[PDB]
């Protein structure tokens, strides 16, 4: 029926599935219960403070559910048996997994992806190593425990009358073996129990995601009112595609799913092309091929000009090789798990991939193209192993006069000189010796957001509390002065006594990529010569053509949405004459290891800074500091850490050589491995088949030296693309001379590790096309690198660019974003700001093809217990919250559980709820929006459960600063004396000047206070503040709960500075006049009907985005400055320009900005922009509360200049900040008006002529502009024009 009603009826059944009996009503805002704990009792039992027998008496009575503490009922969770003990089930999926159970006596000790190893009682120390490996591999931390995830699927599957196979095999596992792992609810990383395989958490994540993806697509087929998915002529159900794939990826999930990824993505990307009638979506834009100003048209079906080209030697070899990548993968699964199933559904599809058409104008074909790209996320995040392998530089390609390796170097070298000239023409050069120490922290901090590095440090703090290294960007406020000295620069890292350490972090699907953590003695000499390349290429505006000679437009590095950022793929795939060649390099970074790149790059930057020869940094010339950053032996010999290469022997070989040749202390030995002193005696006696022990070397293989272009460098993303442009422009040369007149090149563009051209293929002949395609692959092989024919595509109607797929002028989307796991253990210290991001995540998910009704239910599942279990205190039955005292009857079975109401996702923000709307996800609900949504007469059936629970929401968590555990005198001020702007440094030379400037409205930013706010800003991180003030907030959260009232009120306006979007309730809003009746066109199909009807009746964004408020206009222009934007905001600069009164001259405005530690090059535009907007400026700000920060809203036409003229009609006597709150109310109301099916009318602000209700508007506008609390402090000037204009206009 409704969404809020049947959503809450299922969530109430989940908690009565997660707990045996709990009287959870809807009308209550929260339910409070207690849980039993025994470990913290047993510590008290060791000290001997007892009254009553705790263990047996409490546990028996909890199972009989009679007893309760302080009136609040106390109970435990349901066991792992009873989650799926309501029904029994047997399945072949569980019989495959128990056949894939491998004993201890088969394992390889350093596989990159784990197999299914059996747990055994009285386990040996090598099975303890697998227990060490399993605890470090399959960490499934996240939002919600995996047990109550399974109660959600079990509850949902009974309602939709469909049984997913992920639920089937889990129910087949539960009744045989009871509980695979005991996971905690307070933290989500702890788990210690392990039944028949270690891979049971990675199994249960793979089983839940197979259940969610089936509940997605069966619900989506109901939404488009179809019973099957069509592929050309035939029909296949997509549940059969998942079930054959889940069986295949079962016996080794993290290796089989990784290798099936390339034939799956290639199959969709070659589906529609080659068919004889081809339907496209017509679109036209600028004459450049990289034009983003695309508007769209109707559909049409053209004949195919390339209908005969696909019977060539290229396309027949590419499909044959992609079949072998499947056939090598499935035959690997035949041997491991003893099953004889050969994946017959998908292989029938791919046999005729170039022939059968794909038409986007049907819903059935668009769903299947997006379904096969979403099937890759079935195994969760990829936690892997990498062995530390050296360069093995005895096998890389020598510079021969046969191949073109030396021409890569001279063309890489030239492109660096061109980039430094084009940045010099755009006033970006390297930083001078005057400004070295003042730009050092600027570039080290904002490239730490780009590529973060490491240097060990002792971070000390006093009021006696010691903090560890805490690897962040504030390290250079401690040792910023001595990193650039004589002895710190002259050390090389090939010796054993000093080295650098690799760091590992996982990705959503791929292998786990390691990040190099380079020292500061090699980064800050590398950082100074990289600077004009970083800021210049972030200017995204450029024109791409090979006959144009400007490097700034071709290479792109890295407005929010990906539909408006990749509209070139939607235009060029619609053209019948564009034949894109997009290559990719398998094993790219290992072929940057050759001297073709690094020696070519190094002599480029030497000759480029040769005009800067005379200037010196503390006596160091540019040639000396270019060697301190790169080094002829620094990166040529850098010892890097990682896990050490470990062998496996027998214990008889160990006992006779133990005390003779085994040491400890140099490098750390893993948990279940035995050590050995050297590596020469390790590999000598190494071979065994029983492998009764495992050895690992500590000082023989000291570390692993590599000469590889590191990802930890500052020049990583730039120099990967200059070499990519150099290999690209030789491919332009050789193809033009080998086959002249064929395959002209209209545009090119280069990102790191990919290459894309938009070419006009001239001749349609198979005998001459393979002469072209073989000349491409031989040119890239002569350039040292290696290209793969099974991944490189040359096809007319299919364009892909950086994980953005487009086919025939339409959008084939993918959602590989995970919902369960993450790359770090998620702390929920700000719960209200957490699920606000989780709503905006699922908006991007539903815009990429997810179901609306299912993604609504996941967010109602989260909002009950995102922040439940983090309690340590006990409450009274008389509505009182206290800290519990350590007594005998208060320490046993006492942890509070707070289950929130599932309708807290619709109570608006500021009323302790989250602002999602039940009609659409991309609409947020503010305080005034709840008043208008209950006012519309057709929301009463939907918003009936939200109306009865609006104010009953208990408040959430927050982390604030404290006067305790705050200031330390000397940690930052050591480097803060050596670092200030020259405007700031002159103020610190005379104490009379520092007294004249604190009288200015700098206030909290005076030159005696700028140091102290800079240190309190650095200490917002985890290990110093959040781990220390965790004791503080629990004593402050109890105060906020007892002081919380259940009366709520919508307030017009806000505090005396800012206004909200609730300013629009000052006037009446009517709806007059029909606009039109034309449904718009858009390239993105596969949208839910709550999202389709907004994109239908309101078109996409064809114009540029509006510059709406003053506050967002500052943050665009404060973005050019670097340090302060991470610390100071647009709020504090706007109060300085408010407290200054009327702005009197431009030169007075620039000198107060540079006194606020702002860069001189950016402060001159601030004073030019603000003194042009002086006559329209008013003393007001704006709190948007994020009504357009999502991806789907920025893809729409709304909140632009042309939107306001054709929908809004406001009176002329409104100041610009008041206009912005009106138009931001307008874009939300016209979105809700379209999502309901209501006719689109032009809304107009309505004010009558009687003075009895005109005076109340006149009193309120004087109250908002000139508040009473701001005039008593002497802040409002009477000489402002918009303050004088308000009194005369409205009466």
């Amino acid at each position: 029926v409704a969404i809020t009603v049947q959503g809450a009826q299922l969530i109430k059944r989940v908690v009565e599935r997660f707990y045996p009996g709990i009287a959870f009503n809807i009308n209550e805002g929260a339910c409070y219960i207690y849980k039993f704990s025994d470990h913290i009792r047993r510590i008290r039992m060791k000290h001997g403070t007892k009254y009553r027998r705790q263990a047996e008496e409490i546990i028996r009575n909890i199972s009989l559910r009679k007893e309760r503490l302080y009136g609040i009922p106390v109970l435990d969770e349901v066991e792992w048996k009873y989650v799926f003990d309501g029904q029994t089930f047997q399945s072949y999926a569980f019989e495959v997994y128990v056949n894939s159970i491998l004993p201890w006596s088969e394992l390889d000790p350093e596989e990159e992806f784990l197999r299914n190893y059996r747990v055994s009682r009285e386990m040996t120390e090598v099975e303890k190593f697998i227990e060490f490996r399993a605890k470090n591999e399959m960490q499934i931390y996240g939002d919600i425990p995996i047990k109550v995830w399974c109660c959600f699927i079990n509850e949902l599957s009974a309602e939709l009358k469909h049984v997913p196979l992920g639920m089937q095999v889990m129910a087949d596992f539960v009744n045989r073996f009871d509980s695979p792992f005991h996971q905690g609810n307070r933290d989500l990383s702890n788990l210690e129990d392990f039944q028949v395989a270690y891979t049971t958490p990675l199994l249960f994540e793979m089983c839940c995601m197979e259940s969610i993806l089936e509940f997605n697509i069966k619900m989506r087929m109901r939404e488009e009112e179809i019973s099957a998915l069509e592929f050309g002529d035939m029909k296949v159900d997509p549940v059969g595609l998942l079930r054959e794939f889940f069986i295949l990826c079962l016996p080794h999930p993290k290796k089989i799913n990784n290798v099936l990824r390339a034939p799956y993505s290639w199959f969709v990307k070659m589906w529609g092309v080659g068919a004889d009638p081809i339907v496209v979506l017509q679109s036209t834009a600028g004459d450049d091929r990289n034009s983003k100003d695309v508007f769209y048209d109707k559909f049409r079906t053209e004949p195919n000009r390339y209908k005969a080209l696909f019977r060539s030697s290229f396309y027949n070899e590419s499909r044959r090789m992609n079949e072998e990548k499947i056939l090598e993968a499935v035959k690997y699964s035949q041997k491991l798990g003893s099953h004889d199933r050969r994946l017959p559904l998908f292989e029938k599809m791919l046999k005729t991939v170039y022939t059968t058409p794909f038409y986007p104008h049907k819903s059935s074909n668009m769903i299947l193209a997006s379904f096969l790209l979403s099937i890759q996320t079935i195994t969760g995040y990829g936690r892997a192993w990498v062995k530390n392998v050296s360069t093995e530089f005895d096998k890389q390609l020598k510079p021969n006069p046969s191949n073109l390796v030396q021409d890569v170097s001279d063309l890489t070298r030239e492109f660096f000189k061109q980039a430094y000239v084009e940045a010099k023409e755009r006033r970006e050069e390297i930083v001078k010796p005057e400004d070295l120490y003042t730009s050092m922290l600027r570039l080290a901090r904002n490239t730490s957001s780009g590529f973060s590095t490491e240097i060990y440090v002792k971070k000390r703090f006093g009021p006696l509390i010691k903090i560890n290294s805490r690897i962040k960007a504030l390290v250079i406020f401690t040792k910023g002065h001595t990193v650039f000295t004589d002895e710190e620069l002259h050390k090389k890292y090939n010796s054993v006594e000093l080295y650098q350490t690799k760091g590992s972090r996982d990705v959503p699907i791929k292998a786990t990529r390691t990040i190099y953590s380079i020292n500061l003695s090699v980064l800050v000499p590398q950082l100074i010569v990289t600077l004009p390349l970083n800021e210049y290429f972030s200017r995204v505006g450029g024109i791409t053509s090979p006959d144009y000679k400007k490097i700034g437009g071709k290479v792109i590095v890295g407005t929010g949405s990906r539909v408006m950022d990749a509209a070139d793929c939607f235009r060029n795939s619609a053209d019948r004459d564009i034949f894109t060649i997009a290559i990719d390099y398998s094993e790219y970074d290992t072929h940057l290891t050759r001297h073709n790149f690094r020696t070519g790059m190094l002599q480029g930057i030497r000759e480029a800074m040769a005009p800067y020869r005379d200037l010196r940094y503390e006596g160091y010339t540019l040639e000396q500091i270019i060697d301190f950053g790169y080094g002829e032996g620094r990166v040529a010999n850098t010892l890097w850490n990682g896990k050490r290469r470990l062998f496996k022997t027998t214990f008889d070989a160990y006992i006779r050589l133990d005390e003779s040749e085994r040491d400890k202390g140099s490098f750390k030995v893993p948990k279940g491995v035995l050590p050995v002193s050297s590596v020469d005696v390790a590999n000598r006696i190494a071979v065994d088949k029983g492998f009764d022990t495992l050895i690992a070397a500590t000082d023989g293989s000291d570390l692993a030296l590599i000469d590889t272009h590191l990802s930890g460098e500052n020049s990583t993303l730039i120099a990967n693309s200059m070499h990519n442009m150099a290999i690209g422009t030789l491919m332009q040369r050789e193809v033009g001379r080998e086959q002249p007149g064929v395959l002209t090149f209209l545009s090119e563009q280069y990102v790191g590790d990919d290459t894309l051209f938009y070419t006009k293929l001239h001749t349609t002949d198979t005998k001459v096309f393979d002469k072209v395609a073989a000349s491409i692959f031989d040119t890239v092989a002569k350039c040292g690198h290696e290209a793969s024919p099974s991944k490189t595509m040359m096809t007319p109607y299919s364009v892909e660019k950086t994980q953005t797929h487009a086919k025939q002028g339409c959008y084939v989307p993918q959602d590989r974003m995970m919902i369960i796991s993450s790359e770090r253990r998620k702390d929920i210290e700000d719960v209200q700001g957490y699920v606000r991001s989780q709503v905006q995540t699922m908006i991007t998910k539903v815009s990429r093809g997810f179901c609306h009704d299912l993604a609504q239910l996941i967010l109602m599942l989260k909002t009950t217990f995102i922040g439940a279990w983090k309690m340590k205190r006990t409450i009274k039955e008389d509505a009182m919250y206290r800290d519990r005292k350590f007594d005998s009857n208060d320490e046993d079975g006492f942890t509070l559980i707070q289950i929130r109401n599932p309708l807290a996702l619709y109570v608006p923000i500021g009323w302790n709820g989250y602002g999602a709307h039940p009609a659409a996800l991309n609409i947020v609900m503010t305080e005034e929006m709840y008043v208008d949504s209950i006012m519309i007469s057709k929301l009463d059936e939907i918003m009936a459960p939200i109306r009865r629970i609006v104010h009953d929401i208990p408040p959430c968590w927050n982390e604030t600063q404290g006067d305790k555990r705050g200031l330390i005198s000397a940690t930052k001020m050591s480097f803060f004396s050596k670092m200030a702007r020259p405007a700031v440094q002159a103020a610190l030379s005379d104490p009379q000047i520092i007294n004249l400037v604190e009288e200015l409205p700098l206030g909290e930013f005076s030159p005696g206070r700028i140091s102290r706010t800079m240190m309190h800003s650095a200490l917002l991180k985890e290990s110093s503040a959040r781990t220390l003030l965790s004791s503080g907030y629990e004593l402050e959260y109890q105060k906020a709960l007892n002081s919380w009232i259940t009366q709520v009120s919508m307030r017009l306006g806000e505090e005396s500075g800012v206004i909200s979007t609730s300013y629009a309730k000052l006037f009446d809003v009517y709806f007059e006049g029909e606009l039109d009746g034309a449904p718009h066109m858009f390239p993105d199909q596969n949208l839910s009907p709550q999202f389709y009807i907004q994109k239908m009746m309101i078109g996409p964004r064809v114009s540029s985005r509006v510059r709406n408020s003053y506050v967002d206009r500052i943050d665009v222009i404060l973005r050019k400055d670097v340090v302060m934007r991470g610390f100071i905001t647009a709020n504090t600069i706007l109060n300085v320009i408010e407290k200054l009164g009327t702005n009197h001259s431009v030169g007075d405005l620039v000198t107060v900005f540079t006194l606020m530690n702002i860069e001189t090059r950016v402060a001159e535009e601030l004073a030019e922009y603000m003194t042009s907007e002086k006559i329209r400026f008013d003393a007001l700000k704006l709190l948007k509360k994020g009504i357009a920060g999502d991806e789907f809203t920025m893809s729409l036409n709304v909140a632009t200049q042309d939107f306001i003229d054709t929908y809004l009609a406001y009176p002329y006597q409104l100041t610009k900040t008041e206009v912005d709150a009106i138009s931001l109310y307008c874009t939300q109301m016209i979105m809700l008006r379209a999502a309901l099916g209501l006719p689109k009318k032009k809304m107009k602000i309505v004010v009558t002529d009687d003075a009895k209700k005109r005076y109340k508007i006149r009193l309120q506008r004087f109250r908002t502009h000139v508040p009473k609390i701001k005039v008593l402090k002497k802040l409002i000037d009477p000489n402002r024009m918009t303050v004088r204009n308000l009194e005369n206009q409205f009466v």
């Binding site: 000139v1266 009477p1278 004088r1284």
Partner: peptide, 22 residues
């Protein structure tokens, strides 16, 4: 509510704290 008296002259009337006390 009176514009050029409530935001202008009440500054000037409350400027007595500037000259007498300092």
């Amino acid at each position: 509510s009176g514009p050029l008296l409530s935001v202008f002259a009440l500054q000037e009337i409350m400027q007595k704290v500037r000259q007498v006390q300092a």
